[PDB]
RNA sequence: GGUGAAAUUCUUGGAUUUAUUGAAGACUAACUACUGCGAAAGCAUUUGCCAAGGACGUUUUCAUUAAUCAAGAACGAAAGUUAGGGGAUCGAAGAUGAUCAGAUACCGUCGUAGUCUUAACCAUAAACUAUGCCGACUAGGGAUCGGGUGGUGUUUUUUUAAUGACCCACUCGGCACCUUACGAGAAAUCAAAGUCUUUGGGUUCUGGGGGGAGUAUGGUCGCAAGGCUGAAACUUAAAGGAAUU
């Protein structure tokens, strides 16, 4: 039974604060409660917990992350150049 | 009143050994000055000369060469490879309407370590009974020529030292290796290799580079 | 009502063609509209040619031409260069010369 | 009058009676 | 494919899934060839390939998470490694793997 | 607490005691638990190690750089930032890099930085939503908040107190000679206005 | 047999550019344009200016050495005409007939795998 | 430098030019055509990966499963909107230099958004062939794209084939042109816009003089801009189309 249209996990702000306000808020809200997919045992159950820290249910590895999601866009980028550049010195 | 005429040095070039005239002409560098001389701020140049003035017949027209300046001793400045080129009319006048071009290139090494990429143009042909007014290809042809051509080329390059290299491309043995496997596909006439760019070189090695002069 | 079969030029079966720009206005028009002509004409000229071969290395040794197209844009097109207008039935005839 | 300068014409005029009835609403 | 012949083994041949009895198919010199996920750790890995070569058993590291192997093996469920205890009509046992 | 980035403790061995040596990283996003860090001019060029920003081509991207060789770590700490090397002068042996504010620096080749980007960004994208939010934020920095405006306290108070409506009454930019007392408003100030146009410099 | 060298004409429109170098090319000499022998700011590119020019031109490139020199032609050329201007043809033959030499000469007119939209918008610069 | 001609501008800061080299983002020149493909939008550098498609070949298979479609839905140029990135280029806005009686423009300089990209919206273009889809029939011509069949056709030589490209005849299915016109039309023209007063193959949609007006109003979608749905009172003898002079 829907049960709000629109508002979603932010309907706890009732009405203050301005509708733009709580749209950029839910987004980044929603990419900070959500379950994730933990690289090293498979599993979906790296949470967060203090911002940049994510940590997986069994198996129990850390990874440092972003602020609100895993892996920020930029950090992945960086990742394949970093890729890029240490291969560029074995061969 | 000044006249950096009456101050200038001269200077006067010379080609490496694969070719058959050596002596390439002048140029006006300064006085070598200590702390700031003639010798080490500038020579690392190149010259666009033709290879038929290089060479001497004009089946040689096209292909400009570029000459690297990198060595330097009593007025005499040997130069080696940096590059080779196509006359612009040359490609502007191989490029018709009516038929099909085909460009393919590939990145590539040798055992004097210079890296390169050479290029490859080739035009389609009309057999010589052909009715049909433009004679295209079929996009098939086109990739599997490339895909020889890129055969082709990979070998020669990493085919020792690009100053072989250089003694493989003056006498346009490549293009007709191209031809040879190509006739089983499509005509193409006009085949070249129309390019070549240097961008990474190994160190210097004062040895190797007298190899090509006397 | 139209005066046409063509509309303007050569487009039939594709939908939409990437513009060009002209060479005199910089007018943005279709290449499948575009009035084009290729220029080849030597670098030398009606009497710099005997000046040439007269002072020069290398006897008359290419004698080599540049060569580009051109883009016109109807309203440079007719402007200077080839239409100027046909009748209604000269219109039709699509013979270069 | 061009009839796209037209178009945009009465849409400001929409914009407008938009705007004034809203006071009132 | 390797998924294409590890998908007949499932259809027409004998294995096992899971970690523990493919040791115990490995001690009894059963296995023929076992698979190991790329998220495998490494001391899992390592004590695998240590008693593979005691049971002179080849292994294949397959380049995939667990979760993409059960998916090979045709399975719902997440398999971190597997042992092909018999291989049916198909020939992975004697081919580039 | 009070920090944007988490951090990352890194055990060592001691190379003249047997004993273990812990030391407190800045968490760079991607390092994880259980992760072999490898410190040293020798070392491979992944997120994660410490090494000379000699001994990385350009275009690499380390975090915690120090300014003079063995400060232990000065730019490019706060959550989501780095700096990007950007050419080497082997001869006197400095690099140059571009901090995160846009400037570039050219310090010591033998300056060490960490591979990657510090974790945690994007932090500041999310509002704050409500005065407690902050609250609590500064409740673990300084007591910095809230502020009252100069222009709503008396004369005595602020350079720009008083008058019978809030105004500031003369230019808010001061200078940089100005004194104790009179830097107010915006210090030396050499344009000011809504920012139209691009930034980021060339 | 001679002593070589560059020309290098760059003869677009509003003014025309001859000027001597070396073979190498780091090494210039004997620049002086067509917008520097006529005073009209609409005479900057005629031929009988860039002739003018030629004149003055070709004197320091023997007055400095060289007896024979190449000469690569080139109009405005990027995102532009892509043709040659009016003081070229002038020019070229203003320094042939001028006692040098020519040899293997060819134009470096700069011409893209088309981009970077021209400027003017997509209407023209009607006028 | 730029232009009809100028001027605003750039120049001890060595401009413009030259040379070697580097960085950024965008684009894909010439080849490019009465050339291909996609439902339309639209699609043009290479290579790898991913699934997709028509035509064709067919003594395979299923056997009426189909045609066209209110509601509903997928996609949907450009611009524009939200949030990041990007921000070379060109460039609504604005500011200028000119021109002008004026000149809020045309021309020149600067140049904000924008232009590119990711996640989301928006759903409109002369989105055009101003021409619904399926089926049948009605008339000649020479080019071409794809597939196929026929061959003591040419060309490649190696030792002759096989190949590949080329040539000739035919046959499907494409994009188009030519010439006629039985026929159609108000004509311009049209192998469909033909096979209609000798008026019926199936089916979907829209129009009913011109203004008023795609306005008012309600409903609905949208962050917005705006999309869809959409009247009337009143006014008016024309408005319009094609061809001729
Ligand atoms: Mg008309
Ligand atoms: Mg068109
Ligand atoms: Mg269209
Ligand atoms: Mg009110
Ligand atoms: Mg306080
Ligand atoms: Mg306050
Ligand atoms: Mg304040
Ligand atoms: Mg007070
Ligand atoms: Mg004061
Ligand atoms: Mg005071
Ligand atoms: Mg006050
Ligand atoms: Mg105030
Ligand atoms: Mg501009
Ligand atoms: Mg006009
Ligand atoms: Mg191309
Ligand atoms: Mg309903
Ligand atoms: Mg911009
Ligand atoms: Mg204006
Ligand atoms: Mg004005
Ligand atoms: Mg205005
Ligand atoms: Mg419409
Ligand atoms: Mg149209
Ligand atoms: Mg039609
Ligand atoms: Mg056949
Ligand atoms: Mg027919
Ligand atoms: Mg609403
Ligand atoms: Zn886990
Ligand atoms: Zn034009």
């Given at each position: 039974?829907?049960?709000?249209?629109?508002?979603?996990?932010?309907?706890?702000?009732?009405?203050?604060?301005?509708?733009?306000?709580?749209?950029?808020?839910?987004?980044?809200?929603?990419?900070?409660?959500?379950?994730?997919?933990?690289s090293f045992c498979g599993k979906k159950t790296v949470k967060r917990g203090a911002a940049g820290i994510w940590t997986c249910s069994c198996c129990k590895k850390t990874v440092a992350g972003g602020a609100?999601?895993?892996?920020?866009?930029?950090?992945?980028?960086?990742?394949?150049?970093?890729?890029?550049?240490?291969?560029?010195?074995?061969? | 009143?000044?006249?950096?005429?009456?101050?200038?040095?001269?200077?006067?070039?010379?080609?490496?050994?694969?070719?058959?005239?050596?002596?390439?002409?002048?140029?006006?560098?300064?006085?070598?000055?200590?702390?700031?001389?003639?010798?080490?701020?500038?020579?690392?140049?190149?010259?666009?000369?033709?290879?038929?003035?290089?060479?001497?017949?004009?089946?040689?027209?096209?292909?400009?060469?570029?000459?690297?300046?990198?060595?330097?001793?009593?007025?005499?400045?040997?130069?080696?490879?940096?590059?080779?080129?196509?006359?612009?009319?040359?490609?502007?006048?191989?490029?018709?309407?009516?038929?099909?071009?085909?460009?393919?290139?590939?990145?590539?090494?040798?055992?004097?370590?210079?890296?390169?990429?050479?290029?490859?143009?080739?035009?389609?042909?009309?057999?010589?009974?052909?009715?049909?007014?433009?004679?295209?290809?079929?996009?098939?042809?086109?990739?599997?020529?490339?895909?020889?051509?890129?055969?082709?080329?990979?070998?020669?390059?990493?085919?020792?030292?690009?100053?072989?290299?250089?003694?493989?491309?003056?006498?346009?043995?490549?293009?007709?290796?191209?031809?040879?496997?190509?006739?089983?596909?499509?005509?193409?006439?006009?085949?070249?290799?129309?390019?070549?760019?240097?961008?990474?070189?190994?160190?210097?090695?004062?040895?190797?580079?007298?190899?090509?002069?006397? | 009502?139209?005066?046409?079969?063509?509309?303007?030029?050569?487009?039939?079966?594709?939908?939409?063609?990437?513009?060009?720009?002209?060479?005199?206005?910089?007018?943005?028009?279709?290449?499948?509209?575009?009035?084009?002509?290729?220029?080849?004409?030597?670098?030398?000229?009606?009497?710099?040619?005997?000046?040439?071969?007269?002072?020069?290395?290398?006897?008359?040794?290419?004698?080599?031409?540049?060569?580009?197209?051109?883009?016109?844009?109807?309203?440079?097109?007719?402007?200077?260069?080839?239409?100027?207008?046909?009748?209604?039935?000269?219109?039709?005839?699509?013979?270069?010369? | 009058?061009?009839?796209?300068?037209?178009?945009?014409?009465?849409?400001?005029?929409?914009?407008?009676?938009?705007?004034?009835?809203?006071?009132?609403? | 494919?390797?998924?294409?012949?590890?998908?007949?083994?499932?259809?027409?041949?004998?294995?096992?899934?899971?970690?523990?009895?493919?040791?115990?198919?490995?001690?009894?010199?059963?296995?023929?060839?076992?698979?190991?996920?790329?998220?495998?750790?490494?001391?899992?890995?390592?004590?695998?390939?240590?008693?593979?070569?005691?049971?002179?058993?080849?292994?294949?590291?397959?380049?995939?998470?667990?979760?993409?192997?059960?998916?090979?093996?045709?399975?719902?469920?997440?398999?971190?490694?597997?042992?092909?205890?018999?291989?049916?009509?198909?020939?992975?046992?004697?081919?580039?793997? | 607490?009070?920090?944007?980035?988490?951090?990352?403790?890194?055990?060592?061995?001691?190379?003249?005691?047997?004993?273990?040596?812990?030391?407190?990283?800045?968490?760079?996003?991607?390092?994880?638990?259980?992760?072999?860090?490898?410190?040293?001019?020798?070392?491979?060029?992944?997120?994660?190690?410490?090494?000379?920003?000699?001994?990385?081509?350009?275009?690499?991207?380390?975090?915690?750089?120090?300014?003079?060789?063995?400060?232990?770590?000065?730019?490019?700490?706060?959550?989501?930032?780095?700096?990007?090397?950007?050419?080497?002068?082997?001869?006197?042996?400095?690099?140059?890099?571009?901090?995160?504010?846009?400037?570039?620096?050219?310090?010591?080749?033998?300056?060490?930085?960490?591979?990657?980007?510090?974790?945690?960004?994007?932090?500041?994208?999310?509002?704050?939503?409500?005065?407690?939010?902050?609250?609590?934020?500064?409740?673990?920095?300084?007591?910095?908040?809230?502020?009252?405006?100069?222009?709503?306290?008396?004369?005595?108070?602020?350079?720009?107190?008083?008058?019978?409506?809030?105004?500031?009454?003369?230019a808010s930019t001061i200078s940089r000679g100005a004194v104790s007392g009179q830097k107010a408003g915006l210090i030396a100030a050499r344009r000011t206005g809504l920012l139209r146009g691009s930034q980021?410099?060339? | 047999?001679?002593?070589?060298?560059?020309?290098?004409?760059?003869?677009?429109?509003?003014?025309?550019?001859?000027?001597?170098?070396?073979?190498?090319?780091?090494?210039?000499?004997?620049?002086?344009?067509?917008?520097?022998?006529?005073?009209?700011?609409?005479?900057?590119?005629?031929?009988?200016?860039?002739?003018?020019?030629?004149?003055?031109?070709?004197?320091?490139?023997?007055?400095?050495?060289?007896?024979?020199?190449?000469?690569?032609?080139?109009?405005?050329?990027?995102?532009?005409?892509?043709?040659?201007?009016?003081?070229?043809?002038?020019?070229?033959?203003?320094?042939?007939?001028?006692?040098?030499?020519?040899?293997?000469?060819?134009?470096?007119?700069?011409?893209?795998?088309?981009?970077?939209?021209k400027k003017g918008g997509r209407r023209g610069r009607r006028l």
């Open positions: 039974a829907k049960r709000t249209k629109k508002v979603g996990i932010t309907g706890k702000y009732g009405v203050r604060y301005g509708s733009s306000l709580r749209r950029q808020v839910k987004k980044l809200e929603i990419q900070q409660h959500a379950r994730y997919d933990c609100y999601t895993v892996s920020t866009a930029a950090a992945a980028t960086v990742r394949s150049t970093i890729r890029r550049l240490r291969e560029m010195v074995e061969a | 009143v000044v006249d950096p005429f009456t101050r200038k040095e001269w200077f006067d070039i010379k080609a490496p050994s694969t070719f058959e005239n050596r002596n390439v002409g002048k140029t006006l560098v300064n006085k070598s000055t200590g702390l700031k001389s003639a010798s080490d701020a500038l020579k690392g140049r190149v010259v666009e000369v033709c290879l038929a003035d290089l060479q001497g017949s004009e089946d040689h027209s096209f292909r400009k060469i570029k000459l690297r300046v990198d060595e330097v001793q009593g007025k005499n400045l040997l130069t080696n490879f940096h590059g080779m080129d196509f006359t612009t009319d040359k490609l502007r006048s191989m490029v018709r309407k009516w038929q099909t071009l085909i460009e393919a290139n590939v990145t590539v090494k040798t055992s004097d370590d210079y890296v390169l990429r050479i290029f490859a143009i080739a035009f389609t042909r009309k057999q010589a009974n052909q009715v049909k007014r433009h004679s295209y290809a079929q996009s098939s042809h086109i990739r599997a020529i490339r895909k020889v051509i890129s055969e082709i080329l990979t070998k020669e390059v990493q085919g020792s030292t690009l100053a072989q290299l250089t003694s493989k491309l003056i006498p346009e043995v490549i293009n007709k290796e191209i031809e040879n496997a190509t006739k089983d596909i499509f005509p193409l006439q006009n085949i070249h290799v129309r390019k070549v760019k240097l961008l990474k070189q190994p160190k210097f090695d004062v040895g190797a580079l007298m190899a090509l002069h006397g | 009502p139209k005066k046409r079969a063509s509309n303007g030029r050569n487009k039939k079966g594709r939908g939409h063609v990437k513009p060009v720009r002209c060479v005199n206005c910089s007018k943005s028009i279709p290449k499948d509209k575009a009035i084009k002509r290729m220029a080849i004409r030597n670098i030398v000229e009606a009497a710099a040619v005997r000046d040439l071969s007269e002072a020069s290395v290398y006897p008359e040794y290419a004698l080599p031409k540049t060569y580009n197209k051109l883009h016109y844009c109807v309203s440079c097109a007719i402007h200077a260069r080839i239409v100027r207008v046909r009748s209604r039935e000269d219109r039709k005839n699509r013979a270069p010369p | 009058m061009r009839a796209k300068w037209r178009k945009k014409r009465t849409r400001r005029l929409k914009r407008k009676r938009r705007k004034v009835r809203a006071r009132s609403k | 494919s390797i998924n294409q012949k590890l998908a007949l083994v499932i259809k027409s041949g004998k294995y096992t899934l899971g970690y523990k009895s493919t040791v115990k198919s490995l001690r009894q010199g059963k296995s023929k060839l076992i698979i190991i996920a790329a998220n495998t750790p490494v001391l899992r890995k390592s004590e695998l390939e240590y008693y593979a070569m005691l049971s002179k058993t080849k292994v294949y590291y397959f380049q995939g998470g667990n979760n993409e192997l059960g998916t090979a093996v045709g399975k719902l469920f997440r398999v971190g490694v597997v042992s092909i205890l018999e291989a049916g009509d198909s020939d992975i046992l004697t081919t580039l793997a | 607490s009070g920090r944007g980035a988490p951090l990352a403790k890194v055990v060592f061995r001691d190379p003249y005691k047997y004993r273990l040596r812990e030391e407190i990283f800045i968490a760079n996003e991607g390092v994880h638990t259980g992760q072999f860090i490898y410190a040293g001019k020798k070392a491979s060029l992944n997120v994660g190690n410490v090494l000379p920003l000699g001994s990385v081509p350009e275009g690499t991207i380390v975090s915690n750089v120090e300014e003079k060789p063995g400060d232990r770590g000065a730019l490019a700490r706060a959550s989501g930032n780095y700096v990007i090397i950007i050419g080497h002068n082997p001869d006197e042996n400095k690099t140059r890099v571009r901090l995160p504010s846009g400037a570039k620096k050219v310090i010591s080749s033998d300056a060490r930085g960490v591979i990657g980007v510090i974790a945690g960004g994007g932090r500041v994208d999310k509002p704050l939503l409500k005065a407690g939010r902050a609250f609590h934020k500064y409740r673990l920095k300084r007591n910095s908040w809230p502020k009252t405006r100069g222009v709503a306290m008396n004369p005595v108070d602020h350079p720009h107190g008083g008058g019978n409506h809030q105004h500031i009454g003369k980021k410099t060339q | 047999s001679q002593v070589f060298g560059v020309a290098r004409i760059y003869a677009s429109f509003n003014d025309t550019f001859v000027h001597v170098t070396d073979l190498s090319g780091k090494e210039t000499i004997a620049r002086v344009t067509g917008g520097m022998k006529v005073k009209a700011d609409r005479d900057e590119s005629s031929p009988y200016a860039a002739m003018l020019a030629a004149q003055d031109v070709a004197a320091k490139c023997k007055e400095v050495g060289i007896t024979a020199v190449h000469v690569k032609i080139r109009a405005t050329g990027g995102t532009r005409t892509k043709t040659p201007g009016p003081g070229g043809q002038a020019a070229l033959r203003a320094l042939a007939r001028s006692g040098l030499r020519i040899g293997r000469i060819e134009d470096v007119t700069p011409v893209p795998s088309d981009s970077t939209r």
